[PDB]
Design a protein around this nucleic acid. Sequence first.
RNA 1: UUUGCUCCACACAAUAUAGAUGGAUACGAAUAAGGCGUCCUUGUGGCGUCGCUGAACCAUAGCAGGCUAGCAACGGUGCACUUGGCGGAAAGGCCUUGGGUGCUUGCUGGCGAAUUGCAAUGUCAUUUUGCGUGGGGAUAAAUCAUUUGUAUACGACUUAGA
RNA 2: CCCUGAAAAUGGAUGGCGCUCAAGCGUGUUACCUAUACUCUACCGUCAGGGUUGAUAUGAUGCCCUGACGAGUAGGCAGGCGUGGAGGUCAGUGACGAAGCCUAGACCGUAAGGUCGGGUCGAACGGCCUCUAGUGCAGAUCUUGGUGGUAGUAGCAAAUA
RNA 3: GAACUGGCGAUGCGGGAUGAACCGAACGUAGAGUUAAGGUGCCGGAAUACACGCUCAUCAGACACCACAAAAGGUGUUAGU
RNA 4: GAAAUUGUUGAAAGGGAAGGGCAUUUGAUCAGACA
Lengths: 197, 172, 61, 48, 127, 106
Amino acid sequence: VEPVVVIDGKGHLVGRLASVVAKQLLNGQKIVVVRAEELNISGEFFRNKLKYHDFLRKATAFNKTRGPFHFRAPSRIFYKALRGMVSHKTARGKAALERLKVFEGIPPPYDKKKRVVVPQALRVLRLKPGRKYTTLGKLSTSVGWKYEDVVAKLEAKRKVSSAEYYAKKRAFTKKVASANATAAESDVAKQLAALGY
Amino acid sequence: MAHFKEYQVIGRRLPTESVPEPKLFRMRIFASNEVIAKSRYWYFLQKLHKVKKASGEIVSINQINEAHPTKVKNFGVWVRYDSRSGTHNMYKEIRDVSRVAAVETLYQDMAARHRARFRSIHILKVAEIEKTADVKRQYVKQFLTKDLKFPLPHRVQKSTKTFSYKRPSTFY
Amino acid sequence: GIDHTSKQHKRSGHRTAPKSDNVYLKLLVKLYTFLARRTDAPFNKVVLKALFLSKINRPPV
Amino acid sequence: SHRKYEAPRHGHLGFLPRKRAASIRARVKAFPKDDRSKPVALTSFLGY
Amino acid sequence: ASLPHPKIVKKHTKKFKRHHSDRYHRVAENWRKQKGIDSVVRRRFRGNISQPKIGYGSNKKTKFLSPSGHKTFLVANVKDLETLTMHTKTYAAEIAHNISAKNRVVILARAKALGIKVTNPKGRLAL
Amino acid sequence: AESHRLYVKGKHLSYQRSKRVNNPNVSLIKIEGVATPQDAQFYLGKRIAYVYRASKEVRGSKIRVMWGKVTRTHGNSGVVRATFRNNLPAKTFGASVRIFLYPSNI
RNA sequence: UUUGCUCCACACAAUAUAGAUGGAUACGAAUAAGGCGUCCUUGUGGCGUCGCUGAACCAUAGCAGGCUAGCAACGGUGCACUUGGCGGAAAGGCCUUGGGUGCUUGCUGGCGAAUUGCAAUGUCAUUUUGCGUGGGGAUAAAUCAUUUGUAUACGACUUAGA
RNA sequence: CCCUGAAAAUGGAUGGCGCUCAAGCGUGUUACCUAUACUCUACCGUCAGGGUUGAUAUGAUGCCCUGACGAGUAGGCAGGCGUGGAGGUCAGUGACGAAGCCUAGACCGUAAGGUCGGGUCGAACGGCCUCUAGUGCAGAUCUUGGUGGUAGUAGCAAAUA
RNA sequence: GAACUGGCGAUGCGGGAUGAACCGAACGUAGAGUUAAGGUGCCGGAAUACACGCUCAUCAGACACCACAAAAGGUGUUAGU
RNA sequence: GAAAUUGUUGAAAGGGAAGGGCAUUUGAUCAGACA
């Protein structure tokens, strides 16, 4: 239903948010997950790091290279598991993988711009309260992701150079309210709420 | 099994020149249809008496209704599940509106907690309790209290679309 | 599919025309036919069958 | 089979692609951590 | 110049190649019911060639008809041409390849004095 | 105005296909919006047109068309089925799709 | 080496489109909680209120949006000038003053639209490149051959040379 | 149901991703997807039953009507296709170009194969009824002849120059 | 290595990921529709359906043939006698 | 003067083979039909 689509991962579920974005995809829906470092997952932090732990040993013997590359970088990760669900190795694949970007933290050509959520893939509606969960945030750290604190600074920022976008969009829309009741009893505004509106 | 219907099935033991008027056996059944029923019927008599679908015959097969469906009753129920091993008896209690949940709900419960099936459960007897207290297991007694009230916390709402604009909420 | 019930595509297993190639045997058969179709009497059905027959089955009399 | 005699490897794994570095000058792969008080200075120096 | 027949449906337009043909230079595209005990084409498995079988025939009505809807006929000389005279809507002509150029234009000409369509009037035209 | 559109927007998802065998004759429709089999019932019979663009101009245009139509509800979602004169082309899985409003009934 | 090259223009040819066909419409945090307004001791404060899905909100009438006349308003918005600021996470965008000027559907009119013949996407997007007219700008390297040996199987490397 | 008990050798496998009031387990209700199966229709074939000598248009082994069936190695039968030569025939094609050969040009047949457009070429050769055979090839470490990739490679370095 | 039948070999087709033999069902060429066995988060056509329960596993579990696990223990939790 | 097999030319394709099936699309190429 649009040309692009900026999701904000936060409060997500790799896993689920996971799909939807692969599905989409295969249906022409350029998507652009952000923020991510704040992903999420079923399971006590510990694991997963256990989980993680493996898809790590799995190598190639005979040349550790040319083998299954273990990215770290929240991003990448989400990615992957996204991916897995998009048949790449064909063309329609790929023509799929392009459509999708991904970053941890909302950079620019997006911090603008709006973002959304994916309900059906929000922790906070999948789980039941009490079950422990994760935070790709840690995870990534912990298996080595140099950069989590450099994001977590550029966050402190833009959570502002936003707010102060805000307390300014909001003192506006409010006058428009104390200058929108002078003119409306007007004639135009009673016929109106008969059709509706 | 499916959804049930109480049933009254009044078999015989085929008449003979010898023993005319061969005594009539009633059984309240908790089945899916009158094919069940006439089945679920003979299975139980070939355990108390010397008859079968042959030396027999089914006289009547009457759906029975609840009297007061509306009316929330407290059904104790008795049950003989087989297990994997031996066989066991039970006395579960199930707060419900009519028989024909008391047996449905039960079978789901005997499934989930004990991994039995319809195959392996005999619903010995069912009995609307009249007075509270004859009620004996805390997961009913929980609900028969002074002006009862509770919230439904963490309300999750159900959407159709894929995307949304707000980031929800679970107030109620 | 169809438990065939009986072999499918049984060829009669009786001659239908004469195996011979004696113009003459054929003109007869041709008359003979016409002669079980448009009549009823049976006589004809039987000289028809007999005309197609092979050598061994038409012994000398 | 098994080695028989369990001897060690020949050579260190962490110096591989054993190759023709790049340049004749070596990039300093990592400079010292920062203080940020100290006053300003050069952490390195080119000889011969 | 047709006899208002049905539609000319063909069934299987594509050529029936022989299994392997592509792979070999030795094995023609001319069709070969495979007799192999391993053969994937015999055991028709998916996912290979179809083999030719009945099945594919073409309606008795439109058999041996160009698309026009005429059946073609080989015409070596002009006597030849003069059996089609009557059946112009059903039949057609095709002049043989092994005719001189002077005897073509004659047949050509004889064609049209009687309405008849030929399917190779190009032939060997000094053009 | 700025809007002209007096087609419904919507996408070419598929071939009918089982897990591993597909049927180019039938095609599947993501009508942007339509979520149930009802919502789809409206767009049976209504026409479709994967439009696209060849380089070499025909026939006087740069622009070509394949004439759906929509024919039935596909399961829960008001994806729908969707012979076309010619079968859509696969490269099209994810391409935009003009459901029209004619063969009208309003 | 054929008077090339660079930037902005526009003219014409092409060449594509994993797929414009009104608008990707900007808090942050918690969800066993918050938003928005308001009062106050500025606090995890009091009071009111909303959700219970964007089915929202913005834009939206004029030959694919023509030529024209007024009334009410001093607003809205396009286009190009320019003052001053913000932003580096991929900034390559966002806001704002002061004008120059259109269209104004805020209310009232008047002409034109036909025959594209009962539908045929009925073509108004944005890709990259090429050839010339015309408005500003600039005026180089590298490879071989030769040479060095911190280098070297050969290529590569490292130096040297009007 | 979880858990301990539960130790094998490249890296890793509920098929994979992933999944936790499940995308797990047990059970119940519907909707839905989809095989060359089933239903209906078209077309092909075989097989079974039937109808049609009245001369007088074209085939009485013909022309029709009705039905049911269609997998196949080994194996059997049937109808065709093609090749060398022989009797007959078309007073057949032909130096105004026969045979052959090349042709991501056309048409016909389910097919074997047929016919034809264009080029090349230079002396003989097709349909039809029939007789006859040293008659159809991808394979036999088949025969004989040719030619590749290997590859501008191995290598051309003993005997003082 | 025997018995009864059904398979495969001689048999594709959809399903069990994959596989002679298991489950569906046995084949002329095509068109519509309905299903079987299997399924319906995404690879993938199809409910991130509905309903009631159990389960958190610092080696969870996941579906017949089938590619495993036991005796024995647990104030981990759930019904029971 | 056939094929293997080579050489210019022209067209096209090519991320660890190639080729084949059903289906359309585009690019090149062609038959007939219409009167």
